[PDB]
Design a binder for this molecule. Structure first.
Ligand code: CLR
Ligand code: 21B
Ligand code: CL
Ligand code: NA
Ligand code: NA
Lengths: 532, 214, 215
C-alpha cells in the first residue's frame, strides 16, 4: 500500500498554488474590492479568510496527507456512512471539466489572434460590426472589443438560445483540442510529469503579472485606478452583502474540499509539515489576487484618464474583463502585440493548472477505489478527455456560450457547498476533531491549536451555511443579456446540480441497508473509521 | 536507532566557570526535535532546553543550547552550585526515541586528605563463621582513591568490596569504604591487619593497622 | 497542579508479568500523548513506549516491542504498561512522562516506580556492629551484609543524629548485597552515651537494632 510520492516538494507546492490561483484571482477579486469599499473590503475578506477558507483549506490538505487515498476512498474510510461525499466531489469535478476548459480554449484563440501588427479588435469598420459599435465601452453602445468577442470569435449573435447551438466553430474546436492535448500530456504519467508542467503553468503568471504591473504603472492615469481599487470605505463593513461576497470569494478562490487538494496531498510523505504548506499556499493565493488587482486597475485608470471612458463601464467581472475590456486597452498602448500575447498566454496558464488539479482529483480518487484503472491510467484519461472534447464541441458552437453559462451556474455552484458542508460535519462531529487532531499530531509532531479546532467545528459550518443561504437568496431564473432561459433549462440545471448531492443520502441509504444488525448497530459500524 | 553520545561523561566544575557539554548523534536530527533534560540526585528528570535553544520554564538564563544536524551542545555561561546534576540530551525526531549517555556536573574544592579508620570483624560475625575487615576513608577530594590491604605485612587483593559515595551536597567531598572479607579461619591464622590510603593529597599513603592482641 | 504518580513495580523473576500504572491529575489527560521512559541503575535513560491521546497511535522500542503493551484509560485518567516475558535488563526506574508536542519533549515526569527483574533469592541482612579497634573525635560503623533485594533503611539512634554520617551505597556480589555506614561523633559522646544502629529490610520483614560496645 506504499503509493507514489512527489518527486520534490516544490512540485506539490506549485501544484497546489497552480490549482488555487486561476482567473478568479484576476477577474473577480479586484472587482469585489472596488465594488465593496476598496481597501476596506480587505477586512471582511481577511477575517473570512482567517476563519473560513484557510481552516477548510488546511483540513482537506491534512485529510489528504493522512489517509493517502483519493476522495472516494478517503471519505469512505474516514466515515463509511458519508462515503458518497467522495462520489459527490468527483462528479462535480467531472461536470466542471465540461465547461471550465473552454475558457482556456478562448485564451489560446486570442493568443493565436494576436499574431498581427494591428490587433483585430481595435476598429469598428470590420465585417462583423454594427452601427452600435464604438471604439471603447459606453452606456447605450457596444465596444469594438465586445463585438469582436461576440459577433466574430463567439458568433453568439447567430444563436437564438440554448436550443439553437448553431454550427461548429472549428477554429474553436481546434483550440479546445489543443487544451486537452496539453492536459493529457501533463497528467497521463501522473505527478512525475504534472509536478513539472506546473513549474511553467504556475510560474509564468507571476512573470506575466510582473511586467504587466510595470507596464500598467508606467501608464498615465494608473494612480487614478489605484484610487478606484483601494480607496477605503468602511461603511461596507457594516453591510452583510460585503461579508457575503468576501466569504464566497474566499471559499471558491481556495477551493477547499473539492477533492483536489486532497488528491495532491495524498501523494505527500506522511510526516510532511502540511501545516506550513497550507499557510504558505493560502497567502500566495491571496497575495496573487492583490497583485493582480493593481495590474488590472492601473490599466482601468489609464483608460478612464487617457481614453475618456467612465470607470463604471470598465470595472467589470468575469470573462468580459479579460476578453474585452483589458485587450481593448492593450491595443492602444505601444508594443501592443507584446502585451497581448503574454496577457493571453497568462490566463491560459492561469487556467491550465487549475484544470490539471480538477481532473487529477477524479483520476486519483478513482485509482484508489478501482485497481482496474490504476493499472490502466493513460487509457482511462484518454477516454475521459475524449468524452470531454466530444461533449465540449457543444461549447464550440455558435451558441456555445449559452451551454457554458448554464453549467457555470448550476453544475458545481451549490453542490460543492453542501458537499463541503457535510465534509465539515463528518470530520468535526462524526469523526471528531479530537481524532483529527490526533492524526495531525502523529504526522507533523504537534496537534492543531484551539483556534483551528473551534473553526473546524463551529465557524466552518456557519461559514459554509452563510454562503449557501446567500446564493439562494440572490437566486434569479437564469438569464443573460436579454436572453431568458426556458423553464426546462433551469430544470435540467437543477438536475445536474442535484445529481451530485443526491449521492450523499443515496449511498447512506445503500450502505445502511447493506449491513447487518439493528439501526443503532448499523450506525456504529458506518460511524467507525477504517483504522479500527 | 539513532544513538546519542554525550561528552564528557563526568565534568568537574567550580561555580563561576563557563562550561559546554556536547551531544553528538549517529544520524541527523532536526533542530526542533532535540531537547535537554536535567536530573538532580534522587529526583525525576525535568525538561530543561527544548527545541535546541528554547529554555523551558523556570530555567535560568545562564543556560543555552546550540547546534544542528549531528552536533549539539548545552552551555552554562556561569555555573552555580545549584547546577550540580546530570544532563541528558534527547531526540524526538524519529522512532525509537533515544536519550544521550548523559553528562554529570560535579563541583570542585580544595584537595582534602581522607580521615581513615580500620575496623576488625565483630564477635557476631566470627560466631557465624565469617570475618570482614572494614576500612573507612572519609571526606576526601578528588573522588579517585586507592586502598590496599595487608595481612602480616603482605598484600592481599581479594574478597574486597569497595564503595564510594556520591559528592556531598555541602563540603563537596567524597567517601569510600573498603571491605576485606575472609572466613573465620584464615582470619585467625594471622594477626596483623592493615589498610592504607594512596591518595593524591600526599606522597605517603595513610596507614591504619590493628593486631588481634589489643 | 500537574501531577503524575507511578504505581506497581517490585520484584519479578524472569519470564514474569507485571502491570505498571501512572495516575495523572491537573490537566486534560485525554489531550496529551503519554510515554514510558525507564532508567537503568547506571542512571541511563531509555524510552520504552509512547501512546497517543486517543490510543490510536502506539510506538515501542526495539528492546521492548512484542513483550510490553502500553494502554490508556481517559475515563479514569490512567496510563498503563503491561509487561510480560520480563528479562533482567528490564530492571529500571520506570518513569511516566508526557509528550504531546514532539518539538517540546517530555515536559512532565512522574516520581517513578522501581522494577527489579532478578532470579536472586530474597535473603535477610546480617547487621554487624563496627567498633574500634582491637583522639578528639570517634568514628563508629555498621556493616549490613548479605541481603537481597534493595533497599535497606539505615539510621543511627532512631534517626536522632544525621551529622557525621556516611552511608555507603550497596554493591551486589554473587547475588547478595552488602552495605555499610559510618558515624563520627565527639570522643566524649561515646561510649558515655548510646550509639545504636537501625537497619530495616522490608523485603524480608527485618528490623534489627544493634548497639555498639567499646570492647
Ligand atoms: C509579480 C510580482 C509582483 C510577484 C512575484 C511573486 C513571485 C516572485 C513569488 C510568488 C510565488 C513564489 C513561489 C511559490 C513558492 C515557492 C516554493 C519554494 O519551495 C521555492 C520558492 C517558490 C517557487 C516561490 C518563488 C517566488 C514566487 C514565484
Ligand atoms: C479554485 N481553483 C480553480 C479550479 C476550480 C474548479 C475546477 C476547475 C477545473 C476543473 C475542475 C474543477 C473542480 C473544482 C471546482 C468546483 C467548483 C467550481 C470550480 C472548480
Ligand atoms: Cl482571491
Ligand atoms: Na490555476
Ligand atoms: Na483562486
Amino acid at each position: 500500500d506504499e503509493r507514489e510520492t512527489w518527486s520534490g516538494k516544490v512540485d506539490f507546492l506549485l501544484s497546489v498554488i497552480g490549482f488555487a490561483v486561476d482567473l478568479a484571482n484576476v477577474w473577480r477579486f479586484p472587482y469585489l474590492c472596488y465594488k465593496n469599499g476598496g481597501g476596506a473590503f480587505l477586512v471582511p475578506y481577511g477575517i473570512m479568510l482567517a476563519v473560513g477558507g484557510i481552516p477548510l483549506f488546511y483540513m482537506e490538505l491534512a485529510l489528504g496527507q493522512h489517509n493517502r487515498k483519493g476522495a472516494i476512498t478517503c471519505w469512505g474510510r474516514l466515515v463509511p456512512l458519508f462515503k458518497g461525499i467522495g462520489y459527490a466531489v468527483v462528479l462535480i469535478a467531472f461536470y466542471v471539466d465540461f465547461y471550465y476548459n473552454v475558457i482556456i480554449a478562448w485564451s489560446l484563440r486570442f493568443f493565436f489572434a494576436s499574431f498581427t501588427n494591428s490587433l483585430p479588435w481595435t476598429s469598428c469598420n470590420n465585417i462583423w460590426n454594427t452601427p452600435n459599435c464604438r471604439p471603447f465601452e459606453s452606456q447605450g453602445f457596444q465596444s469594438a472589443a465586445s463585438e469582436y468577442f461576440n459577433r466574430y470569435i463567439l458568433e453568439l449573435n447567430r444563436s437564438e438560445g440554448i436550443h439553437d447551438l448553431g454550427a461548429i466553430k472549428w477554429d474553436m474546436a481546434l483550440c479546445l483540442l489543443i487544451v486537452y492535448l496539453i492536459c493529457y500530456f501533463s497528467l497521463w504519467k501522473g505527478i512525475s510529469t504534472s509536478g513539472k508542467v506546473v513549474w511553467f503553468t504556475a510560474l509564468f503568471p507571476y512573470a506575466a503579472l510582473l511586467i504587466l504591473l510595470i507596464r500598467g504603472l508606467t501608464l498615465p492615469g494608473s494612480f487614478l485606478g489605484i484610487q478606484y481599487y483601494l480607496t477605503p470605505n468602511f461603511s461596507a463593513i457594516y453591510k452583510a452583502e460585503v461579508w457575503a461576497d468576501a466569504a464566497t470569494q474566499v471559499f471558491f478562490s481556495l477551493g477547499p474540499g473539492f477533492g483536489v487538494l486532497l488528491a495532491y496531498a495524498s501523494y505527500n510523505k506522511y510526516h510532511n509539515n502540511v501545516y506550513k504548506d497550507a499557510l504558505l499556499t493560502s497567502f500566495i493565493n491571496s497575495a496573487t489576487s492583490f497583485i493582480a488587482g493593481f495590474v488590472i486597475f492601473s490599466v482601468l485608470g489609464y483608460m478612464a484618464h487617457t481614453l475618456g471612458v467612465r470607470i463604471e463601464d470598465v470595472a467589470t467581472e468575469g470573462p468580459g474583463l479579460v476578453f474585452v475590456v483589458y485587450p481593448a486597452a492593450i491595443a492602444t498602448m505601444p508594443a501592443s502585440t507584446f502585451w497581448a500575447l503574454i496577457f493571453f498566454m497568462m490566463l491560459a496558464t492561469l487556467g491550465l493548472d487549475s484544470s490539471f488539479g480538477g481532473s487529477e482529483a477524479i483520476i486519483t480518487a478513482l485509482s484508489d477505489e478501482f485497481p482496474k484503472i490504476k493499472r490502466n491510467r493513460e487509457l482511462f484519461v484518454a477516454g475521459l478527455f475524449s468524452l470531454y472534447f466530444v461533449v465540449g464541441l457543444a461549447s464550440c458552437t455558435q451558441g456555445g456560450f449559452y451551454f457554458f453559462h448554464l453549467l457555470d451556474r448550476y453544475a458545481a455552484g451549490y453542490s460543492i457547498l453542501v458537499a463541503v458542508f457535510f465534509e465539515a460535519i463528518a470530520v468535526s462531529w462524526i469523526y471528531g476533531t479530537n481524532r483529527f487532531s490526533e492524526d495531525i499530531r502523529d504526522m507533523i509532531g504537534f496537534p492543531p491549536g484551539r483556534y483551528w479546532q473551534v473553526c473546524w467545528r463551529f465557524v466552518a459550518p456557519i461559514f459554509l451555511l452563510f454562503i449557501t443561504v446567500y446564493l439562494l437568496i440572490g437566486y434569479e431564473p437564469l438569464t443573460y443579456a436579454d436572453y431568458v432561459y426556458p423553464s426546462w433549462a433551469n430544470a435540467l440545471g437543477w438536475c445536474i446540480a442535484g445529481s451530485s448531492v443526491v449521492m450523499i443520502p443515496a449511498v447512506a441509504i445503500f450502505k445502511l441497508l447493506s449491513t447487518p444488525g439493528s439501526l443503532r448497530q448499523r450506525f456504529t459500524i458506518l460511524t467507525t473509521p477504517w483504522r479500527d | 536507532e539513532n544513538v546519542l553520545t554525550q561528552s564528557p561523561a563526568i565534568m568537574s566544575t567550580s561555580p563561576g566557570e563557563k562550561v559546554t557539554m556536547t551531544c553528538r548523534a549517529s544520524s541527523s536530527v532536526g533542530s526542533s526535535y532535540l531537547h535537554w533534560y536535567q536530573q538532580k540526585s534522587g529526583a525525576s528528570p525535568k525538561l530543561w532546553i527544548y527545541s535546541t535553544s528554547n529554555l523551558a520554564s523556570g530555567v535560568p538564563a545562564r543556560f543555552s543550547g546550540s547546534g544542528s544536524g549531528t552536533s549539539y551542545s548545552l552551555t552554562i555561561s556561569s555555573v552555580e552550585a545549584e547546577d550540580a546534576a546530570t544532563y541528558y540530551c534527547q531526540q524526538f525526531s524519529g522512532y525509537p526515541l533515544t536519550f544521550g549517555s548523559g553528562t554529570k556536573l560535579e563541583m570542585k574544592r580544595a584537595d582534602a586528605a581522607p580521615t581513615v579508620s580500620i575496623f576488625p570483624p565483630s564477635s557476631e560475625q566470627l560466631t557465624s563463621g565469617g570475618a570482614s575487615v572494614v576500612c573507612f576513608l572519609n571526606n576526601f577530594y578528588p573522588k579517585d582513591i586507592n586502598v590496599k590491604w595487608k595481612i602480616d605485612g603482605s598484600e592481599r587483593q581479594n574478597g574486597v568490596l569497595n564503595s564510594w559515595t556520591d559528592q556531598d551536597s555541602k563540603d563537596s567531598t567524597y567517601s569510600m569504604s573498603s571491605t576485606l572479607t575472609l572466613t573465620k579461619d584464615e582470619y585467625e591464622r594471622h594477626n596483623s591487619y592493615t589498610c592504607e590510603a594512596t591518595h593524591k593529597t600526599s606522597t605517603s599513603p595513610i596507614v591504619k593497622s590493628f593486631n588481634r592482641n589489643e | 497542579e500537574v501531577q503524575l504518580v507511578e504505581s506497581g513495580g517490585g520484584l519479578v523473576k524472569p519470564g514474569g508479568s507485571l502491570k505498571l500504572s501512572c495516575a495523572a491529575s491537573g490537566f486534560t489527560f485525554s489531550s496529551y500523548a503519554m510515554s514510558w521512559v525507564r532508567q537503568s541503575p547506571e542512571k541511563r535513560l531509555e524510552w520504552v513506549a509512547e501512546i497517543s491521546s486517543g490510543g490510536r497511535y502506539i510506538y515501542y522500542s526495539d528492546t521492548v516491542t512484542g513483550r510490553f503493551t502500553i494502554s490508556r484509560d481517559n475515563a479514569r485518567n490512567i496510563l498503563h504498561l503491561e509487561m510480560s516475558s520480563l528479562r533482567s535488563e528490564d530492571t529500571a526506574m520506570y518513569y511516566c512522562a508526557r509528550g504531546e508536542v514532539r518539538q517540546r519533549g517530555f515536559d512532565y515526569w512522574g516520581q517513578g516506580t522501581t522494577l527489579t527483574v532478578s532470579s536472586a533469592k530474597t535473603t535477610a541482612p546480617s547487621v554487624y556492629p563496627l567498633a574500634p579497634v582491637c583522639g578528639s573525635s570517634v568514628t563508629l560503623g555498621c556493616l549490613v551484609k548479605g541481603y537481597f533485594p534493595e533497599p535497606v533503611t539505615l539510621t543511627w539512634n532512631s534517626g536522632s543524629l544525621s551529622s557525621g554520617v556516611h552511608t555507603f551505597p550497596a554493591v551486589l556480589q554473587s547475588d547478595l548485597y552488602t552495605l555499610s555506614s559510618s558515624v563520627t561523633v565527639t570522643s566524649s559522646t561515646w561510649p558515655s552515651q548510646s550509639i545504636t544502629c537501625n537497619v530495616a529490610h522490608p523485603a524480608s520483614s527485618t528490623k534489627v537494632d544493634k548497639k555498639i560496645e567499646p570492647r
